[PDB]
Amino acid sequence: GFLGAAGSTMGAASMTLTVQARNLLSGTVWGIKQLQARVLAVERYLRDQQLLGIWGCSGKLICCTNVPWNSSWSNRNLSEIWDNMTWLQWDKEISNYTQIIYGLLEESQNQQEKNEQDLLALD
Amino acid sequence: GFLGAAGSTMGAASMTLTVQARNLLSGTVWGIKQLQARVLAVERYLRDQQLLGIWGCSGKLICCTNVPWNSSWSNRNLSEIWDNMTWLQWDKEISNYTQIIYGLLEESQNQQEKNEQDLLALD
Amino acid sequence: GFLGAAGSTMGAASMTLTVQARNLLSGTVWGIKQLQARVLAVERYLRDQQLLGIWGCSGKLICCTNVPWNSSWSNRNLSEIWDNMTWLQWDKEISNYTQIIYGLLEESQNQQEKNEQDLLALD
Amino acid sequence: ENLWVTVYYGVPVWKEAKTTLFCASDARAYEKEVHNVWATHACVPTDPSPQELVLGNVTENFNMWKNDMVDQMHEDIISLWDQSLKPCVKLTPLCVTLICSNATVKNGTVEEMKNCSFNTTTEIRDKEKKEYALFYKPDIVPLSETNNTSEYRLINCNTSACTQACPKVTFEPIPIHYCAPAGYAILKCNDETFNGTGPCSNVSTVQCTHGIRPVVSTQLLLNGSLAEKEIVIRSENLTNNAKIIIVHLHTPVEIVCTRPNNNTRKSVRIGPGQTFYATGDIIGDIKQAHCNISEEKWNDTLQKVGIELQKHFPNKTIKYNQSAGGDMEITTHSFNCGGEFFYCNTSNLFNGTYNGTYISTNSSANSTSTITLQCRIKQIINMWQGVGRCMYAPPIAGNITCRSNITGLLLTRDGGTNSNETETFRPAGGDMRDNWRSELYKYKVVKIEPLGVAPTRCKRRV
Amino acid sequence: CNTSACTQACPKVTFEPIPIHYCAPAGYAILKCNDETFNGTGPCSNVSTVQCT
Amino acid sequence: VKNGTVEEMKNCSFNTTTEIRDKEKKEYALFYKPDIVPLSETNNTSEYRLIN
Ligand SMILES: *[C@@H]1O[C@H](CO)[C@@H](O[C@@H]2O[C@H](CO)[C@@H](O)[C@H](O)[C@H]2NC(C)=O)[C@H](O)[C@H]1NC(C)=O
Numbered sequence: 001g002f003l004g005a006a007g008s009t010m011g012a013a014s015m016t017l018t019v020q021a022r023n024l025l026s027g028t029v030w031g032i033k034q035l036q037a038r039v040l041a042v043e044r045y046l047r048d049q050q051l052l053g054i055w056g057c058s059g060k061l062i063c064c065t066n067v068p069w070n071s072s073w074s075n076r077n078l079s080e081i082w083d084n085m086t087w088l089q090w091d092k093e094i095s096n097y098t099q100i101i102y103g104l105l106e107e108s109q110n111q112q113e114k115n116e117q118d119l120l121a122l123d
Numbered sequence: 124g125f126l127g128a129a130g131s132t133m134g135a136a137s138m139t140l141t142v143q144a145r146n147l148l149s150g151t152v153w154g155i156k157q158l159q160a161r162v163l164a165v166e167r168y169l170r171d172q173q174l175l176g177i178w179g180c181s182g183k184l185i186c187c188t189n190v191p192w193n194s195s196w197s198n199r200n201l202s203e204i205w206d207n208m209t210w211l212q213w214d215k216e217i218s219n220y221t222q223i224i225y226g227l228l229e230e231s232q233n234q235q236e237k238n239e240q241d242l243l244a245l246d
Numbered sequence: 247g248f249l250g251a252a253g254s255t256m257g258a259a260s261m262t263l264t265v266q267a268r269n270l271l272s273g274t275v276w277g278i279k280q281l282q283a284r285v286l287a288v289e290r291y292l293r294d295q296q297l298l299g300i301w302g303c304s305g306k307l308i309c310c311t312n313v314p315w316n317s318s319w320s321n322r323n324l325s326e327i328w329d330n331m332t333w334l335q336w337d338k339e340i341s342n343y344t345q346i347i348y349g350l351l352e353e354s355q356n357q358q359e360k361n362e363q364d365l366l367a368l369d
Numbered sequence: 370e371n372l373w374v375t376v377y378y379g380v381p382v383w384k385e386a387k388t389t390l391f392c393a394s395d396a397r398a399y400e401k402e403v404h405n406v407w408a409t410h411a412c413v414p415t416d417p418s419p420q421e422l423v424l425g426n427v428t429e430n431f432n433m434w435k436n437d438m439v440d441q442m443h444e445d446i447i448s449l450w451d452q453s454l455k456p457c458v459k460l461t462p463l464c465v466t467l468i469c470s471n472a473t474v475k476n477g478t479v480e481e482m483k484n485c486s487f488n489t490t491t492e493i494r495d496k497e498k499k500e501y502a503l504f505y506k507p508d509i510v511p512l513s514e515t516n517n518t519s520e521y522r523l524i525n526c527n528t529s530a531c532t533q534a535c536p537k538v539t540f541e542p543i544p545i546h547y548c549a550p551a552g553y554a555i556l557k558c559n560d561e562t563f564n565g566t567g568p569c570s571n572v573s574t575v576q577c578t579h580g581i582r583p584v585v586s587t588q589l590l591l592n593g594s595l596a597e598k599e600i601v602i603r604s605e606n607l608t609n610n611a612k613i614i615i616v617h618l619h620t621p622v623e624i625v626c627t628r629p630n631n632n633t634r635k636s637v638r639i640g641p642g643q644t645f646y647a648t649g650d651i652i653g654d655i656k657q658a659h660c661n662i663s664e665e666k667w668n669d670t671l672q673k674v675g676i677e678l679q680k681h682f683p684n685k686t687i688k689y690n691q692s693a694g695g696d697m698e699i700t701t702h703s704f705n706c707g708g709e710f711f712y713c714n715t716s717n718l719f720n721g722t723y724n725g726t727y728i729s730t731n732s733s734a735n736s737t738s739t740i741t742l743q744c745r746i747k748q749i750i751n752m753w754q755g756v757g758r759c760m761y762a763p764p765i766a767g768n769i770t771c772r773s774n775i776t777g778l779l780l781t782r783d784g785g786t787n788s789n790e791t792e793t794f795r796p797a798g799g800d801m802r803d804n805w806r807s808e809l810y811k812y813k814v815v816k817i818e819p820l821g822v823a824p825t826r827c828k829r830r831v
Numbered sequence: 832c833n834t835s836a837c838t839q840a841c842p843k844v845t846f847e848p849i850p851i852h853y854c855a856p857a858g859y860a861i862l863k864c865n866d867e868t869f870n871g872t873g874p875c876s877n878v879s880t881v882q883c884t
Numbered sequence: 885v886k887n888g889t890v891e892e893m894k895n896c897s898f899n900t901t902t903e904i905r906d907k908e909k910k911e912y913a914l915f916y917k918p919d920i921v922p923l924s925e926t927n928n929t930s931e932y933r934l935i936n
């Protein structure tokens with residue numbers, strides 16, 4: 001199912017993610033707007049892949065990072081997230097702090113890359 | 124050569140694969156069909172890269188996996204594959220069991236990712 | 247800044263590279279040439295990513311390799327590169343030997359991949 | 370416990386968004402050279418192999434009146450109709466000092482036709498000859514205010530020019546499907562008690578919509594979908610009488626229209642290499658084209674609609690009356706079938722009342738008591754204004770009949786004051802968006818956002 | 832003037848049959864048979880990959 | 885309009901096709917002198933033409 005994991009818990013929904021990112025081509029051309037859907041879908045996919053790659057996450061959907069989790073973002077227990085809450089509710093509740101997390105991930109990835117380059121080279 | 128490895132053995136043909144995947148842009152626009160070739164080529168390339176990436180193979184053409192090889196698929200000796208057989212003949216002989224291999228690779232990659240996430244975290 | 251690192255030294259300019267590779271969509275369609283900019287930008291981005299990936303560098307902007315640096319290419323000291331020289335001047339001075347470096351990187355990546363495949367398998 | 374941020378890709382999270390969908394049709398064969406206006410020329414063949422997967426733990430809000438999908442469908446239909454009228458002939462020299470005579474046809478209750486002779490340009494473009502044709506009275510206007518009963522003119526040539534419809538295209542409303550592009554999804558509400566708004570407890574993700582019939586109608590809905598359990602009433606706001614109230618039936622009502630006249634197709638060389646088709650002569654007697662429905666079933670359907678309406682109006686009686694005046698294109702049920710455009714006076718249908726007493730028609734083995742509506746056939750069509758409205762529909766030889774199913778009604782209330790418990794319902798028409806609004810009310814288009822962030826107890830392996 | 836209308840050819844265009852080439856798009860290839868005894872069908876023992884015709 | 889230093893306009897009457905495309909009526913309009921040219925080289929001060 002394309003959205004078979006929707007409605008389940010976050011832990012249950014964190015499985016078989018590959019079916020969520022296997023969109024293919026469709027339709028026959030009638031005018032320029034038909035091709036605009038294809039090119040904008042390609043641009044969105046490339047944007048998502050580039051955003052995921054600049055954080056040090058390439059080729060893997062699940063990617064654990066080293067940025068600490070601030071308690072002020074959600075301030076809810078672990079049993080309130082992965083046991084009963086759904087992904088849509090969690091996204092609606094956490095969308096207010098996406099930019100800070102993205103900036104922290106970018107800074108952490110750059111810092112880790114620079115530290116790796118410094119430590120590997122000086123030996 | 125774009126197809127210089129064609130006609131040789133599988134072992135001989137498993138070299139300089141980079142020349143097989145370096146297609147670039149071409150042509151000047153006359154109508155919408157001229158641009159349709161470009162966008163469909165881009166879509167095919169993205170589809171191939173996404174299919175290769177969901178198996179745990181990103182940025183590498185040769186990618187050894189952990190899925191066991193069933194003897195019923197080919198039931199031929201190793202000397203009958205990498206010594207005299209060509210890639211076209213092998214593809215024509217093995218195209219009947221591509222879906223099973225793809226599904227096994229997807230399941231194995233998901234299982235390995237989940238096991239890695241579980242083992243790294245619990246330490 | 248999109249080009250905030252321009253004009254500084256190579257060492258100073260080798261920071262916050264992510265802002266240099268975060269181009270997104272823009273414009274509304276008027277004719278086919280408007281869409282041609284989008285598709286050619288996508289093709290150029292895919293070409294750059296493919297060229298970077300065939301050298302063994304996927305998902306990382308900085309990528310140290312094992313190819314030796316020939317002294318005949320620049321024959322200048324390390325203090326003449328990373329201390330005062332800018333990226334534009336360095337590119338204008340080093341553009342005459344890009345093809346040799348690209349070929350060496352491709353050959354080295356293929357050789358390393360084959361050696362890894364041989365050494366991992368025979369154990 | 371200490372938590373760390375982790376990014377997940379391929380997450381089923383969606384938000385409302387706007388996008389252009391793709392039209393699709395079944396595997397229809399090309400058959401003859403004649404091809405449909407909106408099939409096998411601007412859409413793609415589809416495959417019903419993917420099914421609607423039901424999400425059993427989601428509560429998604431749905432809206433009907435605030436939806437751009439119907440607007441996009443209307444724009445696409447307008448664009449297709451504009452495109453179809455380009456390659457067909459431009460006519461031009463037809464509107465001249467037509468000389469119309471009573472001819473062999475004599476007085477009668479039928480709408481009748483006028484035999485008009487006029488000068489037409491022959492194959493030589495600097496020479497003229499005499500030709501004649503039969504025209505409908507609504508398509509004929511007196512030339513000047515002066516008293517002259519012999520000189521007439523077409524209704525056109527005071528407005529934008531007219532393009533004759535090609536004879537090699539058909540106006541058959543074949544079903545079509547709407548499919549979302551990549552990265553988008555379509556959610557369908559399977560609940561049968563959907564009143565137009567509010568949450569849906571049974572949602573399903575579907576690849577494409579079902580067959581959508583683009584039938585052109587104003588007062589009634591023909592060849593539409595059927596309700597699951599009972600008649601369902603939809604309206605943006607019952608308090609506002611200016612709005613249009615839709616009633617979706619549960620059981621269809623059979624309707625049979627017919628044109629007993631046996632017309633003859635003529636051919637006149639109007640311009641070089643382009644022909645003009647008109648009615649040459651009528652063979653036999655002159656009769657009235659008419660539509661028939663069954664009186665008992667129509668009365669039962671009206672009573673069902675009345676009891677359904679009485680839920681919102683407990684202390685007010687229901688009354689059905691005629692349309693509130695207007696021009697012929699507004700007050701009459703206008704539709705097209707077989708290639709001919711009919712305008713039927715529906716004043717004899719909506720004549721009744723319901724104050725809360727149920728009446729059942731039992732026995733009546735000889736139930737041939739039917740209700741017949743007279744209709745007027747038009748050739749000049751101005752269905753969509755401001756986009757090349759004028760169109761000439763060529764006539765078709767022989768007598769025709771069209772059997773269809775009424776599946777919905779469109780009504781409008783009227784105001785009142787001082788404890789006026791005699792509110793009445795009248796037929797409604799005009800805007801064409803409402804016709805297709807009742808068919809795509811279940812589908813919502815959403816955009817998938819696969820990037821997500823969650824806390825979990827893990828760290829990068831260094 | 833008994834059939835469809837006629838359009839005069841422009842005097843500023845020429846009908847010279849200049850040679851043209853056909854090139855496949857990206858992801859496709861063109862195979863040319865170099866055998867001189869090709870009767871229309873059957874296998875080719877001398878095939879060559881070419882960018883354009 | 886009479887003589888003056890202004891560029892002035894010419895009042896020209898002509899036959900126009902009415903709503904009937906095989907009938908003509910008389911109409912008139914004011915046109916600028918640069919937009920009006922004599923029809924023919926022959927001497928005629930009453931018959932004129934558009935510059936196009
Ligand atoms: C409609 O009018 C036209 C003439 O305006 C009729 O055509 C003429 O009919 C008479 C009677 O048969 C013939 O003698 C003439 O030769 C016809 N003239 C032409 C030019 O065809 C025509 O018959 C009338 N149609 C009807 C149904 O009365």
Ligand SMILES: *[C@@H]1O[C@H](CO)[C@@H](O[C@@H]2O[C@H](CO)[C@@H](O)[C@H](O)[C@H]2NC(C)=O)[C@H](O)[C@H]1NC(C)=O
Nearest residue numbers: 625627628629630631766767768769770771772
């Ligand atoms: C032209 O009219 C005749 C009769 O007036 C039609 O023949 C009838 O068609 C109906 C179709 O529903 C049948 O049920 C009847 O049995 C037919 N015969 C009679 C005597 O009514 C004929 O179909 C009409 N032309 C077209 C093209 O439909």
